[PDB]
Amino acid sequence: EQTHNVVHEANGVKLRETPKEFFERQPNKGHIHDVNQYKQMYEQSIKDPQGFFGPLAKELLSWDHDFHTVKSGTLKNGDAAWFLGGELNASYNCVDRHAFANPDKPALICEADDEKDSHILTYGDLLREVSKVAGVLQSWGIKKGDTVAVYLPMNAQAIIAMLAIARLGAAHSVIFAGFSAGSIKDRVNDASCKALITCDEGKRGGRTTNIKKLCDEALVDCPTVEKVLVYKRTNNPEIHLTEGRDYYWDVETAKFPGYLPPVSVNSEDPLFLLYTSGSTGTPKGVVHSTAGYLLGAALSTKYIFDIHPEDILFTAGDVGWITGHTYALYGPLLLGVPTIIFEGTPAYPDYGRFWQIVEKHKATHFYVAPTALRLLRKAGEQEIAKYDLSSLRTLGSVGEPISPDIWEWYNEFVGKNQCHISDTYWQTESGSHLIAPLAGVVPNKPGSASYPFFGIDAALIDPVTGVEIEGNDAEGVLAIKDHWPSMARTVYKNHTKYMDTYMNPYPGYYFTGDGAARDHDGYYWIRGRVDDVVNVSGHRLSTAEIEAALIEDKKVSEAAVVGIHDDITGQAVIAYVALKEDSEGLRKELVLQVRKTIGPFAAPKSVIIVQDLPKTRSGKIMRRILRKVSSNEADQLGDISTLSNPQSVEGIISAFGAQFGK
Amino acid sequence: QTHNVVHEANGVKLRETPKEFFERQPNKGHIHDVNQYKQMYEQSIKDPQGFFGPLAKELLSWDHDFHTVKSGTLKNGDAAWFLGGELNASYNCVDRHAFANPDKPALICEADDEKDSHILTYGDLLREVSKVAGVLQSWGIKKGDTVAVYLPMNAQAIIAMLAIARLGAAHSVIFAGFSAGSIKDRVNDASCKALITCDEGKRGGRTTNIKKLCDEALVDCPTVEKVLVYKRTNNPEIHLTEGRDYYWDVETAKFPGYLPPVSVNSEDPLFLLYTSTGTPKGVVHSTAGYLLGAALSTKYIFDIHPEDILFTAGDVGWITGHTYALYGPLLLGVPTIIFEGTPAYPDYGRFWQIVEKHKATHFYVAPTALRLLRKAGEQEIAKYDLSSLRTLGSVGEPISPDIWEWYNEFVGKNQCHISDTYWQTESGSHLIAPLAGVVPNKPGSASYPFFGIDAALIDPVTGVEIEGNDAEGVLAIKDHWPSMARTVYKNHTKYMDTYMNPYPGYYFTGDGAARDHDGYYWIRGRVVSGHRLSTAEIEAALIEDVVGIHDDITGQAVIAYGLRKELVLQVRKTIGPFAAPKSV
Amino acid sequence: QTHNVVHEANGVKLRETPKEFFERQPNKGHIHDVNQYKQMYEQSIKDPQGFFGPLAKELLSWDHDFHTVKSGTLKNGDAAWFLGGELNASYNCVDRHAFANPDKPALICEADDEKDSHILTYGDLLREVSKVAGVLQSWGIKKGDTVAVYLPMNAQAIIAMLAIARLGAAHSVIFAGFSAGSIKDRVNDASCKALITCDEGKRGGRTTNIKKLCDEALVDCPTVEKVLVYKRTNNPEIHLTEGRDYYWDVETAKFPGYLPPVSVNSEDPLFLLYTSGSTGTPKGVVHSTAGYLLGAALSTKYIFDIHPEDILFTAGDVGWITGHTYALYGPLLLGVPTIIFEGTPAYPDYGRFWQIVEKHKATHFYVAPTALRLLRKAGEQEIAKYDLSSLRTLGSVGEPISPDIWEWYNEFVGKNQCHISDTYWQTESGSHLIAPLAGVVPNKPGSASYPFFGIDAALIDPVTGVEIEGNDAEGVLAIKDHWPSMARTVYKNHTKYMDTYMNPYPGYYFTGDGAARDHDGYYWIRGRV
Numbered sequence A: 001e002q003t004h005n006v007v008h009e010a011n012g013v014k015l016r017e018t019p020k021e022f023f024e025r026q027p028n029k030g031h032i033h034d035v036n037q038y039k040q041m042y043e044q045s046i047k048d049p050q051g052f053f054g055p056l057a058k059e060l061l062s063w064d065h066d067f068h069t070v071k072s073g074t075l076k077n078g079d080a081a082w083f084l085g086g087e088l089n090a091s092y093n094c095v096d097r098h099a100f101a102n103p104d105k106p107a108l109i110c111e112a113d114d115e116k117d118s119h120i121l122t123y124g125d126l127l128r129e130v131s132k133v134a135g136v137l138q139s140w141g142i143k144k145g146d147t148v149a150v151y152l153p154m155n156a157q158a159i160i161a162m163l164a165i166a167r168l169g170a171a172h173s174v175i176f177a178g179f180s181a182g183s184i185k186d187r188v189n190d191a192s193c194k195a196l197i198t199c200d201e202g203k204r205g206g207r208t209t210n211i212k213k214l215c216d217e218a219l220v221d222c223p224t225v226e227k228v229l230v231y232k233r234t235n236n237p238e239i240h241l242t243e244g245r246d247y248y249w250d251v252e253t254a255k256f257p258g259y260l261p262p263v264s265v266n267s268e269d270p271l272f273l274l275y276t277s278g279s280t281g282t283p284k285g286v287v288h289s290t291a292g293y294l295l296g297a298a299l300s301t302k303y304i305f306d307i308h309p310e311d312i313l314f315t316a317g318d319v320g321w322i323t324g325h326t327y328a329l330y331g332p333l334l335l336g337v338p339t340i341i342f343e344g345t346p347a348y349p350d351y352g353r354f355w356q357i358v359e360k361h362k363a364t365h366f367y368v369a370p371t372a373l374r375l376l377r378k379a380g381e382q383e384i385a386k387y388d389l390s391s392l393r394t395l396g397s398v399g400e401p402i403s404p405d406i407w408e409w410y411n412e413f414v415g416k417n418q419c420h421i422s423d424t425y426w427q428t429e430s431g432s433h434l435i436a437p438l439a440g441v442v443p444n445k446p447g448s449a450s451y452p453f454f455g456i457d458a459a460l461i462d463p464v465t466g467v468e469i470e471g472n473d474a475e476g477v478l479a480i481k482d483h484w485p486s487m488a489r490t491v492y493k494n495h496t497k498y499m500d501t502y503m504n505p506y507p508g509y510y511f512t513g514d515g516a517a518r519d520h521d522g523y524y525w526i527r528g529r530v531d532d533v534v535n536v537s538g539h540r541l542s543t544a545e546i547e548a549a550l551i552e553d554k555k556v557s558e559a560a561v562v563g564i565h566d567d568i569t570g571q572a573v574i575a576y577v578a579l580k581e582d583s584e585g586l587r588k589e590l591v592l593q594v595r596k597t598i599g600p601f602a603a604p605k606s607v608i609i610v611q612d613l614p615k616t617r618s619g620k621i622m623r624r625i626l627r628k629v630s631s632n633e634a635d636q637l638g639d640i641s642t643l644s645n646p647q648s649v650e651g652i653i654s655a656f657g658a659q660f661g662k
Numbered sequence B: 001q002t003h004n005v006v007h008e009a010n011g012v013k014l015r016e017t018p019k020e021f022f023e024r025q026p027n028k029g030h031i032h033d034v035n036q037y038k039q040m041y042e043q044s045i046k047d048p049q050g051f052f053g054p055l056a057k058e059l060l061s062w063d064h065d066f067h068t069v070k071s072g073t074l075k076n077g078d079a080a081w082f083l084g085g086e087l088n089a090s091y092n093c094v095d096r097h098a099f100a101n102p103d104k105p106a107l108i109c110e111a112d113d114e115k116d117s118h119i120l121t122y123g124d125l126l127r128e129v130s131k132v133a134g135v136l137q138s139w140g141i142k143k144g145d146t147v148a149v150y151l152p153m154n155a156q157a158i159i160a161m162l163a164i165a166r167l168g169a170a171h172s173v174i175f176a177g178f179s180a181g182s183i184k185d186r187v188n189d190a191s192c193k194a195l196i197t198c199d200e201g202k203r204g205g206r207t208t209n210i211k212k213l214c215d216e217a218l219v220d221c222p223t224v225e226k227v228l229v230y231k232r233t234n235n236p237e238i239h240l241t242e243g244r245d246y247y248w249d250v251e252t253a254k255f256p257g258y259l260p261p262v263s264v265n266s267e268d269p270l271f272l273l274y275t276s277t278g279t280p281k282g283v284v285h286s287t288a289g290y291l292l293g294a295a296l297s298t299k300y301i302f303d304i305h306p307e308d309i310l311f312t313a314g315d316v317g318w319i320t321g322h323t324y325a326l327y328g329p330l331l332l333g334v335p336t337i338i339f340e341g342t343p344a345y346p347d348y349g350r351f352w353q354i355v356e357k358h359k360a361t362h363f364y365v366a367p368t369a370l371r372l373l374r375k376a377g378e379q380e381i382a383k384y385d386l387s388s389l390r391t392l393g394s395v396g397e398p399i400s401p402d403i404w405e406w407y408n409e410f411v412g413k414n415q416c417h418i419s420d421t422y423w424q425t426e427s428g429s430h431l432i433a434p435l436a437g438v439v440p441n442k443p444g445s446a447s448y449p450f451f452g453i454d455a456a457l458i459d460p461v462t463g464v465e466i467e468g469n470d471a472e473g474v475l476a477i478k479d480h481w482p483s484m485a486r487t488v489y490k491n492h493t494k495y496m497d498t499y500m501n502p503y504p505g506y507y508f509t510g511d512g513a514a515r516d517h518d519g520y521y522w523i524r525g526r527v528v529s530g531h532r533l534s535t536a537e538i539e540a541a542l543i544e545d546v547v548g549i550h551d552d553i554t555g556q557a558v559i560a561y562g563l564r565k566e567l568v569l570q571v572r573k574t575i576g577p578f579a580a581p582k583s584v
Numbered sequence C: 001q002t003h004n005v006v007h008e009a010n011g012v013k014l015r016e017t018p019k020e021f022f023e024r025q026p027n028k029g030h031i032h033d034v035n036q037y038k039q040m041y042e043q044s045i046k047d048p049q050g051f052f053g054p055l056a057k058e059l060l061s062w063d064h065d066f067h068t069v070k071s072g073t074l075k076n077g078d079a080a081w082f083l084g085g086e087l088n089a090s091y092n093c094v095d096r097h098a099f100a101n102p103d104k105p106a107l108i109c110e111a112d113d114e115k116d117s118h119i120l121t122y123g124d125l126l127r128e129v130s131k132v133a134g135v136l137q138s139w140g141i142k143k144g145d146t147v148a149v150y151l152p153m154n155a156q157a158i159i160a161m162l163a164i165a166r167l168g169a170a171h172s173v174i175f176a177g178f179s180a181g182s183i184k185d186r187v188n189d190a191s192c193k194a195l196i197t198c199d200e201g202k203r204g205g206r207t208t209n210i211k212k213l214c215d216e217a218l219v220d221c222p223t224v225e226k227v228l229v230y231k232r233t234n235n236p237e238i239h240l241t242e243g244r245d246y247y248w249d250v251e252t253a254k255f256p257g258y259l260p261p262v263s264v265n266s267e268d269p270l271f272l273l274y275t276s277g278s279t280g281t282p283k284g285v286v287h288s289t290a291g292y293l294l295g296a297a298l299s300t301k302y303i304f305d306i307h308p309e310d311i312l313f314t315a316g317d318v319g320w321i322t323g324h325t326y327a328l329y330g331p332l333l334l335g336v337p338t339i340i341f342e343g344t345p346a347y348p349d350y351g352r353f354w355q356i357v358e359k360h361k362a363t364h365f366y367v368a369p370t371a372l373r374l375l376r377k378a379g380e381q382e383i384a385k386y387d388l389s390s391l392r393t394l395g396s397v398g399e400p401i402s403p404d405i406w407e408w409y410n411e412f413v414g415k416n417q418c419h420i421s422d423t424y425w426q427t428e429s430g431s432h433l434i435a436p437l438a439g440v441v442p443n444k445p446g447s448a449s450y451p452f453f454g455i456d457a458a459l460i461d462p463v464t465g466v467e468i469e470g471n472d473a474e475g476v477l478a479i480k481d482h483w484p485s486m487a488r489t490v491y492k493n494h495t496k497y498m499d500t501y502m503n504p505y506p507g508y509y510f511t512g513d514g515a516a517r518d519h520d521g522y523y524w525i526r527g528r529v
């Protein structure tokens, strides 16, 4: 049909063909001929994964040992495996092989917080520094199977640290630099890391950040950490190093040579742990294999973004999150292109920094979160005209829904109606892109991620019946019908939590946690999470974890945290608190509690003080009532006589109306 | 036609394989007739490189190629096969079949009480082996470690052995009937880092105290860092030691159903198997050579095809369960029946109920069991449909012509082939046996030597090989073979003193045998400076009025525990001048 | 024609290889003439990938292919060869020759007193090396560990090194003449998990205190968990520490005559060898596995002209690089017998070397000019008592050889019928740098002549730091690019390595020596600067 009765996003939406200038700027024949070749390749990646991914794994990756089986396992049994029998090394495929080919080609284009401190590392430079850091870790006893934590800002040392760890066959666990001491402690202890790599202080927005200080605070309770490597980011001599545990990056790396043999690992040996928040309260360490994850990175980076050897990628992300892992580090370095590592903010020294960077290095591909696009539209639209952005041809959006208006703003003001826009939908647990418009191939509907990617058999499940929905113009739970190379393989030392979360809810499928809709053309429209996980400015948060931090305050008895829409951050956290026995004073105190328990980025937008929370006959909190109230749907609550304290609802409603502003 | 030495063979008609064997055979037999067998055998002796090289590639999956098929000599105790090659045992027993057909049955587990019986597919087996391997790996188990197993004959024993071999470590299986002291000795000699066991066992309906005996042993086993305990009975009164003991179900739940197998060298030890007035010695088997011997013997002697189902009524506590309940059949990708209980529980028809239930085609048992069932449950055999069987194996002890006939008629219905298999823990796999559907049987004779086994009879007095037939003597083997044991753990000298030095240039089985005019071997049971002495005879001469040890000059020395000179002369004039003890 | 700078070169007639060399040669020479050598040399400089790749395949057995022949630069101290490949040193030096012909001799052992001499075949060598590795494997020694050796020059020293390399560990040989303080400094720097030594030694008929010195040093060596002690004299009053010291014979009896060798990466360290430098305490020179082995095999073959039928007698000691490269690896890699001499040139008389050469029909002899000066002074008359007609290559090493000693070496030992190879190299080069190839390069007494494959020699002006073009020149000797057997670091002190070798003249390797180059390109070593 032409009209949609379910997918209202799609009604009267004109397709947006790739502009002709995209192809004029393309350095070579595109990797895909047209949308028909894409459909053929897609159908093969579903019907015949062995014949499709086998050759691609050989083309894009360098192997130390061949694989005998392309694909094994099933979602329902949680035993997925790819490229069995094969051996390889991640740092070899990202550094060594490119350095041998051309050691002088740029690899890390590092733009520091303050541009005066920017620099460029070639592949030859990167090989030597990765080798030396790996040499230090090796002399410390790090070996295949160990885990090493990283607590660094978004700069060269973070990338070097990750690649040095993977060079030895160990798994890195990168901890976002905005995390508090308690969040560091939790992640390090769950992984039992033997070593940590960090720095003395950080630079953000021109202001100094206390990085080593928070490590010392967490490490008092991290008995498994034997040694710490400290990079002199500020060289502030007043930063204390603990004798026998802490050692300086520059001093130790000077003892070792600029080449170290990489350690061969199995395709399914763990490459890294990345701790993610879910519906649990405690963060869960998502584990990724080596071969499957790397192939997914190279494959998506190449085909969805249309990356060629001549190109330059600026992923405005942070390696503390999956987007930096896959599309600032592994994706581009696997393909041998330069990648821009930006340490600062889009506002420093002014709101043209992104564009100053793009113009400076003639970047061809730009990848950013819609939260930033909203900021630059609100505060820095006047800066764009100062910069030449004609080197760009691919503009990616990631991590949250992109509104059609922001899509248009991105298309016109950054791309000049001349670039292809790739709204990429995916997750930490998927490793790489799931649904995205391939650059130069897929026509765009603003606000739609369009078609599923190679190896991704997407489906919609009816939330009522648990049955897959045939046909288009449909809505439901977004699930995937078979595993794919870059799919996460477990939750570290807690594979049962992994099964209960992703595989068991919809047996036979993978459960994304998201709902979506499919229009008459097969285009998917993401409709946000269905498991009440909150995404604030691109950061996955656990409302359960925020409730725990608020309760830790001994003046608080009960806490209930929900998420609502926000014009700036996408979603905002609303915290409801009941006290046992101050005003904004207490509310400010609680916000700071969340800041130092989890991290500044998890602070609630607002704190509502209530006499008590609505609870069932059981004694448990009905959070549905707090969600309906917080979204000004006070009506639609329904019959509340099932509660044990229905009189509380009135107080909840009035408190939200009185305290959300103030 | 007449024998003056091998009296067993006089007037024994050959017993051709019944026609029903071939009617029940799922495919064309692997060997056409005895003449083809003789050609293949002669090559496996004269040209081991050209014979075993191709078979090693056919029957095994390799992670790294081998550059030399065969190396070393018996006289130097440096035997090695497929040098340079790398592989993994659990990959060849599980992974490769799971990829091919994950739903094909692998372990048909018959519990002590049938209500608890279940079937694991190759896909199921891969997941369970991977999860246990993940637990052990997170505990620090790695190549070169030894891990003890103290479990009954059930799925967990099989899973545990394969998970240990998946990491490149060596499993040391300890028969679940052993005492605390027997556990203690074996664990300490092997210096095991971990132990896998269960809380209690079920045998004949009665509960056995398994974990309790382990705790008693482990008080003096400092090398054991952690123990994995399976809830076989879930008896809550069974104590676990904080910080050491962890539950199988709890820990395996933390890890995924796939774990990369760890490649090992062809000559890396696959397992240690301790023997029962001697002190227990850990017989060590290589990885590649042992596996090939298992697959090769299982395939050709038993005539195993992919469609078949093997019931080895043995226990992994002994070599028979190791090779023909686990490795042999799983290497070939067939189902294997793991029976936890006794032949009497819940009644004396259980074996036959099991064979009927799963339509087993191959049955392998010790004459001791056949004597029991003949004495107490003969009437139960006919109650069950046993027409799926075509091969009936006997192992571990001589099968008398009388028992052979009873086995042939009441179990086989004069329609099956009987394979009297002779071998030892140290040989890894069959040495002398009638190939099913190929070799005619003489009841009580193991018949011909197997591929790669150059059998001979040695005069025990002179150490000289006996030429010709109608002969008797010490059973010895003239060259090493792929599945031959490689050492005794951390005691290679005892290995040399036992197998290689008594008759230098040969392997000494410890058994006597006779060879008749047709070449059939008849096992006849167990038997200083080149002169053989009898410790028993020196004790007798001294009593009318002794032990052996290694010696760097005279090879071995005899120590017997004015009068000392009188006794030495007594032994010289009773036995012989060269038979005097070194010291009295 | 005339030299104004290289005064050593004026009026020095070339000395061609005697005819009897080519008569005693068992097979067609590996290089026909000097002109073919220069075509090969120029390829080894202009095309290292195309020259050394095939030679790496030809001379070494691999467990994994390599993907890149050469990587890195002198200026960044990140040189690497045969990247991605794996192999094992003991497999190439023992196993593969045992399989081919186990009865061929490998170690021709001449003890301090000849009555105790014996010969190990490659089959015998493999069984012994396996048993010792089996001992170390059971002790926890594994790839990445370092194991110290404190043994005289005899079979056990050779066996211990090969057994340590069989497991993928690095052996740190400590010359048996070192004091306890020297042992202490070396063992601690390397953090050795185990030590292999003996109870006592035999040197010139006298007993030496070996275990006693180890015990005095080990009181300050916490990392050493276990010690393996060989019974050289079997003196029962030698104390072994309970729980730490075990006997060689007692432990090897427990293990089988074969053990699988452990694969190591091309650039995994094969050994540490501690040198005395101009800067304080000893420094652990580290050598790769593939690069070093290729260099040892390639130079042994082409400079000495070694063939399968030949027998090499390197009268050195494995405490030093000369014994590492040319008493052990070089010859064993090529599957020829090597003569391991424990005693002195003086005991029981000054005809010991020659009695050995005659005894075993040695075709190659390799010694330091210090021994030549000793024998010239004291043992010249003994040379005529022994048949030395099997020799055809006479090597000099470790120090300049004066034209006088050269002539003496040439006439009384070589009988004016042998070729003389004055080899110049260092511990840090792994193998020969400059030497006259046997049967190829005519000699100028006192000159090492031309650089070897992959060695791009040059002279630098010490004052200006600029390479000196043209011949008839003097200055600091340097190399313009790294070579396969070049040392890769100083253990846990890569900065000392960069400061010593790579930084003085960036872009070059600094040999620490001064030299001169004459109009014919022959190099004249002028000693340390």
Ligand SMILES: C#CCOP(=O)(O)OC[C@H]1O[C@@H](n2cnc3c(N)ncnc32)[C@H](O)[C@@H]1O
Binding pocket: A276, A321, A322, A323, A397, A398, A399, A400, A401, A402, A423, A424, A425, A426, A427, A428, A429, A449, A512, A513, A514, A526, A528, A529, A535, A538, A539, A540
């Ligand atoms: C990537 C990343 C960060 O991964 P993660 O931090 O795991 O968050 C994953 C969740 O982010 C949301 N999301 C991500 N990309 C889009 C998109 N293009 N359109 C709409 N929603 C999107 C969904 O809710 C995902 O499940």
Ligand SMILES: C#CCOP(=O)(O)OC[C@H]1O[C@@H](n2cnc3c(N)ncnc32)[C@H](O)[C@@H]1O
Binding pocket: B319, B320, B394, B395, B396, B397, B398, B399, B420, B421, B422, B423, B424, B425, B426, B446, B509, B510, B511, B523, B525, B526
């Ligand atoms: C198998 C097994 C268990 O191996 P193991 O427990 O080592 O006992 C090995 C000894 O068993 C006896 N034996 C084994 N098979 C037969 C046979 N077919 N006919 C006669 N005797 C036999 C011999 O004495 C063996 O040396």
Ligand SMILES: C#CCOP(=O)(O)OC[C@H]1O[C@@H](n2cnc3c(N)ncnc32)[C@H](O)[C@@H]1O
Binding pocket: C275, C321, C322, C396, C397, C398, C399, C400, C401, C422, C423, C424, C425, C426, C427, C428, C448, C511, C512, C513, C525, C527, C528
């Ligand atoms: C080999 C070795 C031992 O290596 P090492 O002990 O490091 O000493 C190395 C130094 O010995 C001197 N040297 C070595 N060989 C010669 C020679 N043929 N002609 C002149 N001088 C020589 C130089 O000074 C070297 O740099």
Ligand SMILES: [Cl-]
Binding pocket: B277, B278, B279
């Ligand atoms: Cl005994």
Ligand SMILES: [Cl-]
Binding pocket: B568, B580
């Ligand atoms: Cl006597």
